[PDB]
Amino acid sequence: KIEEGKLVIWINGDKGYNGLAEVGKKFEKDTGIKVTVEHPDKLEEKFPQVAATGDGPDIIFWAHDRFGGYAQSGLLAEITPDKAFQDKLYPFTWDAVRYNGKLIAYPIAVEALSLIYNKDLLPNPPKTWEEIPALDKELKAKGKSALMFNLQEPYFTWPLIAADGGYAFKYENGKYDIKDVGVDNAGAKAGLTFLVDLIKNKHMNADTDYSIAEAAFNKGETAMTINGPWAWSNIDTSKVNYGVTVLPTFKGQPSKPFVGVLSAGINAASPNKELAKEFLENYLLTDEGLEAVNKDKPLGAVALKSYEEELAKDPRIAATMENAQKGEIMPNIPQMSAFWYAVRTAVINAASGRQTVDEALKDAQTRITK
Ligand SMILES: O=C[C@H](O)[C@@H](O)[C@H](O[C@H]1O[C@H](CO)[C@@H](O[C@H]2O[C@H](CO)[C@@H](O[C@H]3O[C@H](CO)[C@@H](O)[C@H](O)[C@H]3O)[C@H](O)[C@H]2O)[C@H](O)[C@H]1O)[C@H](O)CO
């Protein structure tokens, strides 16, 4: 069982756990309640294990898409923020933490892919996907290329694919309609076709992955790349003069990158649920709390309006939220796994010539709504 009278918190080792510990120190100063932050290896794999036996931390931090699985096994307690507190956060973030109509976690940070560009090679980045082919041609005559990004993960290619109307699962009836999938529609076919053509016309290479694209941009060889806030650190170290902006539009429609919300859930087996609520709502989710964590390790964009408004003073952060609001919250339902694998395959096959674009998406669609 979990010990009563204190709070044990789990957050990944790449996050600002030292800053989080300081908020916990503040909590102890004001309430006398001790807080312990830990960052065990593969914590998101261990949580389901220990939580199933009534053990584990009182609070766990992780991207919201993993919380669907946890809530499915009843591992997270339903949270009770009132209307007033909910209005302190951007409305769309609350949707990322709702399962069977119930709120099961507190939104902390918000992330989404953005268009990253080299200001020295490209002071005026393209506002549309359509003008990249021509831009690539003129940059080649200069010894450089226009764009390079990870094409191995559907998470990275979806922004373009979904731009003109694509979606994973329709969300209206309170939750997701698992039979209403948008990977087979005209918009997706159009998006995936433009993507495949960029490869066929040699503006991109079907084999490019995360490391290949990162190295290219951080060396100054390609003018643009598509990545998230987690990649800025490496770019900073490379000293390339870069900027972060809204993703290019396609067919006049904005790219729709998936959105991941770092969230804080409360262990269903915790005997300290009220303490957890007090800490999360009135200590962490305040300008002072997030500041303490952010100073340790940047959170990127955040769900708390007041603090995000301050952070948006950084154009890279402002662009991150801009792209997020034009994006699609990652579905937390069990069916999303089937979507990831089917779409990953469709892209690989359409780019290798194993299947035409239409046939690749047609099969992915059928496999998902299976
Ligand atoms: O520095 C931390 C940072 O989060 C990195 O870990 C970074 O994460 C980002 O990019 C991921 C994509 O590479 C995002 O993952 C989501 O999308 C993928 C789909 O591409 C999902 O993966 C699922 O599908 C694949 C098949 O393609 C399968 O192998 C996986 O098992 C299955 O889960 C993820 O589940 C989504 O979360 C992530 O949100 C984002 O932060 C990169 O991972 C660094 O390479």
Curated annotation (Swiss-Prot):
Compartments where located: Periplasm
Gene3D superfamilies named in the record: Periplasmic binding protein-like II
> What induces its synthesis?
Induced by maltose and the transcriptional regulator MalT. Permanently repressed by cold shock in a PNPase-dependent fashion.
A single GO BP: maltodextrin transmembrane transport
Task: Tell me the protein's name.
Answer: Maltose/maltodextrin-binding periplasmic protein
- Which coarse location class describes where this protein primarily resides? periplasm
Task: Tell me where on the tree of life, at the top rank, the source sits.
Answer: Bacteria
- Encoding gene per record: malE
**Gene Ontology CC:** ATP-binding cassette (ABC) transporter complex; ATP-binding cassette (ABC) transporter complex, substrate-binding subunit-containing; maltose transport complex; membrane; outer membrane-bounded periplasmic space; periplasmic space
Question: Quaternary structure?
Answer: The complex is composed of two ATP-binding proteins (MalK), two transmembrane proteins (MalG and MalF) and a solute-binding protein (MalE).
Which cysteines pair up through disulfides? They are none
One example of the protein's molecular function in GO is:
maltose binding
Q: Does the keyword Ion transport apply?
A: no
Q: Cite the entry's keywords alphabetically.
A: Periplasm, Signal, Sugar transport, Transport
Q: What does this protein do?
A: Part of the ABC transporter complex MalEFGK involved in maltose/maltodextrin import. Binds maltose and higher maltodextrins such as maltotriose.
Per the UniProt entry, what species is this protein from, by scientific name? Escherichia coli (strain K12)
Q: Which family does it belong to?
A: Belongs to the bacterial solute-binding protein 1 family.
